[PDB]
């Protein structure tokens with residue numbers, strides 16, 4: 574359904590839909606604030622559902638699932654010249670641990686989205702974004718500050734959930750829409766046992782192929798250096814239809830944030846050069862236009878921004894307030910953003926393509942493809958360039 578050798582992925586992630594993220598839909602978390610006190614705001618979906626109780630959580634989520642993304646969004650995505658969406662979903666949509674507070678019902682909408690994709694000629698990756706115990710401690714895994722995916726029976730439960738996903742979406746029924754199943758979003762390499770993570774990836778790969786599926790297996794790079802996965806799941810060992818997903822950002826440390834615009838561009842170009850040397854097909858499954866970490870709660874509920882020296886002991890660079898609203902951005906910030914977007918697009922089209930995080934947010938402009946496109950900062954058509962050939966690719 575896709576030619577990874579000759580076609581280029583031009584897509585968007587459908588984040589904030591099946592896995593709640595406070596920075597993407599702050600309206601669902603803000604009612605828990607007491608005046609200016611954020612100490613009682615649930616920090617992730619686990620605590621949000623637990624605090625509300627099953628009845629209220631299901632009532633609020635049904636409304637969210639039925640309105641956040643609809644068929645109209647798929648038509649708009651196609652109309653903008655995109656050909657692909659990545660869909661994050663948590664393990665709890667398929668299986669609950671004993672005592673899990675989560676509610677289910679996401680699968681009905683996932684299945685509606687696959688039909689909307691088919692009707693609009695859009696291809697999809699299904700991405701298991703949160704595993705039991707958490708594979709990274711981020712709020713977007715469902716459970717913040719916990720790193721227990723490799724403890725107890727959590728790896729085994731994850732493989733069981735993947736088997737369910739393999740049988741439902743890796744077979745003939747969706748072979749014209751599903752062009753990859755991503756085994757696990759952003760496992761945090763540095764805090765995990767890498768030998769056990771490789772075994773899990775291999776077990777997932779073998780389990781999918783054993784069902785008779787020919788669907789591409791997508792493995793996230795686990796924050797390893799470029800080339801790390803070159804010798805894993807290789808054609809020499811009869812392992813095939815494998816894609817590496819690289820996520821690329823320059824906002825999660827003081828050093829990255831302090832770079833001037835030219836150095837931000839040089840780094841983006843280098844991502845393209847280095848990905849070209851890898852031996853597996855690869856796609857930039859996440860990236861954005863952000864040059865700051867100013868979006869409210871991007872680092873988590875009750876955490877500030879490094880950009881204004883309010884988090885991670887980073888030095889003050891600039892005030893975030895003036896950057897929260899795209900209408901208040903200076904001409905220089907608008908130009909810098911457009912340059913940054915174009916360099917990234919050129920670098921990612923140099924290999925398998927790109928998937929912007931994300932399609933929409935309630936009010937964080939750096940992270941919304943819709944907002945950036947409507948304000949003229951994201952090229953439309955996507956091949957348009959106001960700053961051509963910043964990287965000099967051959």
Ligand SMILES: O[C@H]1[C@H](O)[C@@H](O)CN2CC[C@H](O)[C@H]12
Nearest residue numbers: 588594713758759822859930
């Ligand atoms: O929203 C999250 C997404 O859920 C994760 O896969 C990590 N991404 C990295 C940038 C931002 O944190 C974004």
